[PDB]
Amino acid sequence: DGVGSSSGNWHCDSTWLGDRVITTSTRTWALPTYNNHLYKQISNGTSGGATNDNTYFGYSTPWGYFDFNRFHCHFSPRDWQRLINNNWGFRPKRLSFKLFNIQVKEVTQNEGTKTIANNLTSTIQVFTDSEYQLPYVLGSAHQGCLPPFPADVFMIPQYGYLTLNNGSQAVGRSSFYCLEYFPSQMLRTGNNFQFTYTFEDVPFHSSYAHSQSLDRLMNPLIDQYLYYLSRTQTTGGTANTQTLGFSQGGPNTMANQAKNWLPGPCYRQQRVSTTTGQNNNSNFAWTAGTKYHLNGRNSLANPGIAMATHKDDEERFFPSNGILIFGKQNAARDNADYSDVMLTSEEEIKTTNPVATEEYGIVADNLQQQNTAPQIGTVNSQGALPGMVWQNRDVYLQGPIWAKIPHTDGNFHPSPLMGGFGLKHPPPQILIKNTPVPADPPTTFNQSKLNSFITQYSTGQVSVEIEWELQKENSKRWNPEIQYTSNYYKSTSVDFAVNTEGVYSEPRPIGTRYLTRNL
Amino acid sequence: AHSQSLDRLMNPLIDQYLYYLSRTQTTGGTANTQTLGFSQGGPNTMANQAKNWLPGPCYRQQRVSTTTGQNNNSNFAWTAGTKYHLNGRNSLANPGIAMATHKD
Amino acid sequence: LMGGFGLKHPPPQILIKNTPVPADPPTTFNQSKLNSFITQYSTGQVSVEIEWELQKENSKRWNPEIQYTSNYYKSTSVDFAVNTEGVYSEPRPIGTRYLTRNL
Ligand code: NA
Ligand code: NA
């Protein structure tokens, strides 16, 4: 381990071995000094115009962190295509992480003149929250992950966290965490860091779409032996009185047939069209938003439980806050136009999951008698019911991979709503920080903590290797399947490539459900 | 006791890469018509941020204050009680599912 | 067609690049890829050793053969050498077909 010796090589590749695929990606990173080496209490109350739904109390820290919770951090577009076009499923098995070729640079600023040089003896500090003692900030769809394109140099995100709050104030249970309290490895140029991790057992992601629907599992050609109430009143003319008539469900009465299952849970969202002219002329994104109520404040149930984005022929419709939406390259942070973002679609699950913008179904609302007509009620919120079956939200090339399951007494189907794998012991948080280097101190002793430091930052490479287990497709479907494919005809540029300006871009969201499977 | 809340698990300092519908109508004056505007959740919009979880189940109970003067003047302990209906008879869902006794 | 040996598995391409070294980054996080780098270049030596197999000549031709030869008489400079300015130059193209062979 010396100044003149590399401490690691560039490992970027993918190998397919059978029921496994191993991805490996390396990137060059840059880490500045955050918070001026300080920890700062940050808060936001209800003063000014800040609403109560957005209050918070927490801290910003001088630390940065590595994040690769995004599929494109590991799969190239072509690899993603190889995965989704041929496998009914897949899942993470184990990973290796490495930090190397570290270099700490210090910048001198005198008379407009700026010079940067190495500080051969400075160190960075690194450690993993292997015992999950820090607030788990990963799994919240934050920016700062390794770039999709291998040639892009990225900046390391700053670590910050939240605790309990009451307005802009802290409460008795509010917790303060000092990351310097943890043992951490100190590396100088020449030193490297690495660790291994094994994923817990988790189900394969459903990278397939159903080629059958819950309400169409019977034999088209045979009647049931079971009967259903088919008539409640006579029909012979005008002397119509009450009676009781029963019939057997059959090919023409599939909606009446007795069935064994029920569609998945529902939490109805407001519908909105991509054809603005068809929408009400008001600003309802928030006022008509589907939300949950937690201790006084409201949050969008975004994207909320997995529901079909729209029913047959209505591609223009989508749940106001019930789908993942990515931005196109350079889309504005605020009020970006529809043509600057990319809406995803969980259309593939219409097959088992209720459509996100409609009722779950209908229930009786009273007791009918001869003097009281029967009444019905529309169900727009339907929790788990015995016999329900459903699918989870799909995952995307540019979407999240996993999330830490909250440590609670209970929960229900812990599949992270934004999509992905829910893990009790997810990949550990990897914290990194440039060690503060005092600028000359006074010549006579003083109690005060130093606050004058040499200006510096660090850079180096990072590698992440993940082994994935594949669940091969075993279909007897005779006719060809749907497959993700590149466009055929000429185009100004190549999809999933760089610009004349060297800018890489992801033209569209790529899901995972192309192959089909029976129910 | 948890020292964090379900709706405050993100990093206070970083924006999401995910967007949410932020605007449905223009704002420039009185010619306001429908439009579509999207934004990225961030430190000041934590209520809008995409999240992975939902709060536990609910079965709303009637509230009552220990300051009698703030309560309706009637005997509602039973009539306004949260109950379940089993074969013709009703029982108080007491104490029922676990829910926070009160907010801040 | 330009001449030479056609190979299905020719010597591999050898790619080289200077690793980008970020110039100081901003002090508060930003999504954008860095675009400010320290200006640098690299230098070093490179060696290539190739072993060639020769097919010796086995001719019974009685009379001398044609041979590539340096010019005999005086000249301003030496062919295949440097200038008074230190510039090396190849005065002419030199082929390979001097010895002869029957059909
Ligand atoms: Na493509
Ligand atoms: Na010569």
Structural overview:
This is part of a larger assembly, with 3 copies of chain A. By secondary structure, chain A is an all-beta fold. Chain A has one domain: Empty Capsid Viral Protein 2 (Beta Complex), CATH 2.170.30. Helices cover 2% and strands 32% of the residues of chain A. In chain A, strand 13 and strand 14 form a beta hairpin. The first copy, chain A, is elongated and about 110 Å long. Chain A starts with 12 loop residues before the first strand and ends with a strand. Chains A and B meet through strand 4, strand 9, strand 18, strand 19 and strand 21 of A and strand 1 and strand 2 of B. Bound molecules: sodium ion (2 copies). The site of one sodium ion has 3 residues of chain A, from loops. Chain B: It is found in: Virion. Chain B: Belongs to the parvoviridae capsid protein family. Chain B: It comes from Adeno-associated virus 8. Chain B: This is Capsid protein.
Label the structural class of chain A: mainly beta
Distance between the termini of chain A: 57 Å
Which compounds are bound in this model? sodium ion
How many domains of chain A? The number is 1
The CATH C-level name of chain A is Mainly Beta
Rounded to an integer, what's the Rg of chain A over CA atoms? 28 Å
Main beta sheet of chain A: strand number and arrangement? 7 strands, mixed
Cα shape of chain A: elongated
Q: What is the fourth-level CATH superfamily of chain A?
A: Parvovirus coat protein VP1/VP2
The percent of residues in helical segments of chain A reads under 10%
Quickly count the helices of chain A: 1
- At CATH level 2, the architecture of chain A is Beta Complex
Please tally the β strands of chain A and state the result: 31
